Amino acid sequence: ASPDYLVVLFGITAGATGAKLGSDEKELILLFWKVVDLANKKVGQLHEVLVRPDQLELTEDCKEETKIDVESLSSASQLDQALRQFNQSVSNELNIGVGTSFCLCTDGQLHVRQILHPEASKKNVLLPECFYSFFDLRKEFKKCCPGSPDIDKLDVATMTEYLNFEKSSSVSRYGASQVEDMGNIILAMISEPYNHRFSDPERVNYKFEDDNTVVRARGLPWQSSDQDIARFFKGLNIAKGGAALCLNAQGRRNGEALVRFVSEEHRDLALQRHKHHMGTRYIEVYKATGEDFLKIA
């Protein structure tokens, strides 16, 4: 909350980008970042770390759009070591030991909520604490910038255009260009005439105890618990008491779960996990109506 620094973070998977980031369950392969000194209105240099996936398979779309060379990827660290390297780098660059604070900042919701938390969960990686909070730069931009496009229309390109900057994708590779542009967006919003303050970030729920916010998951293995479905949705914020395993007419578990999220935003993110995996099993994710959750829990 009210950090000294932002860490602009941008992830690239072995598959789809943009609005479909994370929808295909492809692994993280490349992470870009840059720090922003808020009080001093300065940015640091661009960083990157390659992340070797368990499955060295890039979609043709990924290859065309990102131009990542698989050779260097095949020599790289996997997620656990890469995120430790990211954490150590940030802490050293910001001299965190003297007591200064930072918060992640991302282009929308999918980088932290749809990529990092579900992937870390599946690989039993313990994410560093900074991954449990972030500013969605699009939402911050909206609060800051009058006459801007609706939140559903915002992205880095729209945001740079609004502010009269040129997009650096004409000269920079995918990922790197977005982080460089986000850096310039942030400097603009914290300066005149906007003078934005970054206050309390969004949170990623880690504990576990209206129609448009509920999903029905189907296909849970007989051994599944409350806690397993919560982990399947790691990265999203389930409402308090908002996850229950369903029973059939005879009181046996029926392989379904009803999950109420805090927002239609998160419900939509959960729908994009349809046929993602719990172990080797597909978990189906459907819309549900709120009357059924009442009865359930």
Question: 78 vs 29, 43, 68, 83, 119, CA distance in Å?
Answer: 9, 28, 16, 9, 11
d(CA 254, CA 216): 12
Instruction: Give residue for tokens 């602009």.
Output: 8
Please state, in angstroms and as integers, the Cα–Cα distance from residue 152 to each residue in 29, 42, 142, 168, following that order.
Answer: 26, 29, 11, 23
The span from the CA of 237 to the CA of 266, in Å, is: 7
Cβ atoms within 10 Å of 40's Cβ, excluding its own = 9
In degrees, rounded to 5, the angle at the alpha carbon of residue 211 between the alpha carbons of residues 207 and 215 is: 50
Secondary element (H or E) of residue 38: none
The answer for 38, left when phi > 0, alpha when psi is -120 to 50, beta otherwise, is: alpha
CA pair distance 121, 236, nearest whole angstrom: 12
Last residue before each gap in the chain (C to N over 2.5 A): 209
Calpha distance 83→143 (Å, rounded): 31
d(CA 106, CA 23): 17
Query: Strands 42-43, 47-50: parallel, antiparallel or unpaired by DSSP?
Result: unpaired
Which experiment gave this structure? Answer: X-ray
Can the peptide bond before residue 149 be classed as cis, meaning omega within 30 degrees of 0?
A: no
Q: CA angle, 261 as apex, 256 and 262 as ends, to 5°?
A: 170
C-alpha separations of 290 from 70, 208, 213, 286, 297 in Å? 46, 20, 8, 13, 11
Report the distance separating Cα 236 and Cα 225, nearest Å: 18
| Declared resolution, Å | 1.9
The amino acid that residue 51 corresponds to is V
